[PDB]
Amino acid sequence: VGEPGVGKTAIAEGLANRIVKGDIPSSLQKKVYSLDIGSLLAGAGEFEERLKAVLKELKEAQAIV
Amino acid sequence: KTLCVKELAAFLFNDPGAIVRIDMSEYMEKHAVSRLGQLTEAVRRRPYTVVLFDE
Amino acid sequence: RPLNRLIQHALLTQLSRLLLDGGVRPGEIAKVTVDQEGEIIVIRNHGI
Numbered sequence: 001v002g003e004p005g006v007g008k009t010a011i012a013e014g015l016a017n018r019i020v021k022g023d024i025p026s027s028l029q030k031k032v033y034s035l036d037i038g039s040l041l042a043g044a045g046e047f048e049e050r051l052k053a054v055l056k057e058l059k060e061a062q063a064i065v
Numbered sequence: 066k067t068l069c070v071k072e073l074a075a076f077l078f079n080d081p082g083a084i085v086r087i088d089m090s091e092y093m094e095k096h097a098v099s100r101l102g103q104l105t106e107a108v109r110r111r112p113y114t115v116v117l118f119d120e
Numbered sequence: 121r122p123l124n125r126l127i128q129h130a131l132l133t134q135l136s137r138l139l140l141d142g143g144v145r146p147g148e149i150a151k152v153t154v155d156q157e158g159e160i161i162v163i164r165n166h167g168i
């Protein structure tokens with residue numbers, strides 16, 4: 001929660017840096033992704049199929065987003 | 066919720082591999098009447114099975 | 121969910137590597153304790 005322009009993306013960028021190093025336990029080293037809601041509507045029903053395929057690989061692999 | 070299902074067919078039906086998984090998530094459509102074809106045809110070739118309705 | 125995520129990465133991964141270089145030989149014991157950091161580590165015997 002913050003003003004539109006405080007650095008919301010940088011919060012997740014710093015957490016991924018500690019995973020590569022070694023300051024994160026192996027039980028918490030999860031893959032960080034950027035769920036883009038606009039990428040699902042690429043090109044000129046279909047939205048329900050692309051949304052389920054993305055929200056499925058993260059559950060079977062246990063990773064944050 | 067997973068070990069209780071695997072032990073159900075491995076003890077009563079004497080076969081842990083007779084367990085189907087129906088992930089109720091992608092079937093949320095309007096044409097799921099004459100298509101689910103999938104669950105009826107699977108239990109026809111094997112009357113001794115366990116049907117799981119995940120989510 | 122963190123069950124298989126921690127065992128297969130901090131208990132089964134380190135033990136599988138010692139079975140190749142010569143860490144755990146078929147005939148000894150596998151000591152599993154907690155290090156000073158607070159994770160699951162396997163006390164190896166011989167070296168590489």
Ligand SMILES: Nc1ncnc2c1ncn2[C@@H]1O[C@H](COP(=O)(O)OP(=O)(O)O)[C@@H](O)[C@H]1O
Pocket residue numbers: 004005006007008009010
């Ligand atoms: N403490 C910080 N150190 C380095 N970069 C930062 C820090 N805080 C914010 N930023 C930068 O600010 C940007 C914020 O981007 P974002 O939150 O996506 O949109 P907006 O620029 O509108 O806030 C990030 O790309 C990040 O690189």
